[PDB]
Design a protein around this ligand. Structure first.
Ligand code: ZAS
Length: 340
């Protein structure tokens, strides 16, 4: 039973020569040598069974990643756990080993325009598949974009993912939300539960802005500060866009604000490709019904050297109340195919 940083990392004998990488949501992430496939892999240790919420996100991630098969979405290669529910205290998810992620990369590396274009293409190609399965990722951000040494990009962490539900998207003003603050669309704070595909496009727009300058475009320090930042750049919403917000508390909040002018993208990003900024503007559109969709974004002139719909595949088969005991049982069943 191998140990890393003083805790159990129980993956042998197939996987040996372990190296710590970092901290996942429910445990440690290590690299290891796959003695069968003769390559180093990543292994995530996950310990969710004490908490219903952890079990939920774990079941979501396993179920979605096992059903998806796409070049720009991380796969699950193997799942290691004990042979019985009684003995299962942890689960290990084995994935392709990716050199870095976009969050780590952006801390020290300036991206060429060619890299930004290629990364954005791969993000949207993966997202097209996700959305085509009627799934919302709901936590897209640089740290959930993995990169290998040849800059192949794979979306990961579907722990907050949901099936799209636009008929039930409406909610009140300042309704609490889980996903990462800096990448939250303005409507989350106003009247949206994040059950439509436009929630993900907003996050991608934030990611594009961040690739252009190595800094988050909207770094709110708390829930309502996030909306301040968004409106400080987009300016005041139009009457038409306000008229789409029927909730009085949210609409009157916006009406209470002094007028703010839009900040031109090319003043924020004077080095950027003008076509990139045109696409950025369409992803960071205030009104979620006017916001560009993933297939339109792929067809945008900025991505012309990569766009090819026949090489941008969709899913064959599109897709909170359960106690942790049933969820542990479902996780055990979902991982059985890798036993042996
Ligand atoms: N998840 N997570 N975060 C903890 C660390 O694990 C890293 N990580 C997650 N999945 C992989 C992966 N598949 N390959 C390499 N590193 C990975 C991620 O970049 C963080 O530095």
């Amino acid at each position: 039973p191998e140990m890393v940083r003083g805790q159990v990392f129980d993956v042998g004998p197939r996987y040996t020569n372990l190296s710590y990488i970092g901290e996942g949501a429910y445990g440690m992430v290590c690299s290891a040598y796959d003695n069968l496939n003769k390559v180093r892999v990543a292994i995530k240790k996950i310990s969710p069974f004490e908490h219903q919420t952890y079990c939920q996100r774990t079941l979501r991630e396993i179920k979605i990643l096992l059903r998806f098969r796409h070049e720009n979405i991380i796969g699950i290669n193997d799942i290691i756990r004990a042979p019985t529910i009684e003995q299962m205290k942890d689960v290990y998810i084995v994935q392709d080993l990716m050199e870095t992620d976009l969050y780590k990369l952006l801390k020290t590396q300036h991206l060429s325009n060619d890299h930004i274009c290629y990364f954005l293409y791969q993000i949207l190609r993966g997202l097209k598949y996700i959305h085509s399965a009627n799934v919302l990722h709901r936590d897209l951000k640089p740290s959930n974009l993995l990169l290998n040494t040849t800059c192949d990009l794979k979306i990961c962490d579907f722990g907050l993912a949901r099936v799209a539900d636009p008929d039930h998207d409406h909610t009140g003003f300042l309704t609490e939300y889980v996903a990462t603050r800096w990448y939250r669309a303005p409507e989350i704070m106003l009247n949206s539960k994040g059950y439509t595909k436009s929630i993900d496009i907003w996050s991608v727009g934030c990611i594009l802005a961040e690739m252009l300058s190595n800094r988050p475009i909207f770094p709110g320090k708390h829930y309502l500060d996030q909306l301040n930042h968004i409106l400080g750049i987009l300016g005041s919403p139009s009457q038409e866009d306000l008229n789409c917000i029927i909730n009085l508390k949210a609409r009157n909040y916006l009406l209470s604000l002094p007028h703010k002018n839009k900040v031109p993208w090319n003043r924020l990003f004077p080095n950027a490709d003008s076509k990139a900024l045109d696409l950025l503007d369409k992803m960071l559109t205030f009104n979620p019904h006017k916001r560009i969709e993933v297939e339109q974004a792929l067809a945008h002139p900025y991505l012309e050297q990569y766009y090819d719909p026949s090489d941008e595949p969709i899913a064959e088969a599109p897709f909170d109340d359960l106690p942790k005991e049933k969820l542990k049982e479902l996780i055990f069943e979902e991982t059985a195919r890798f036993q042996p």
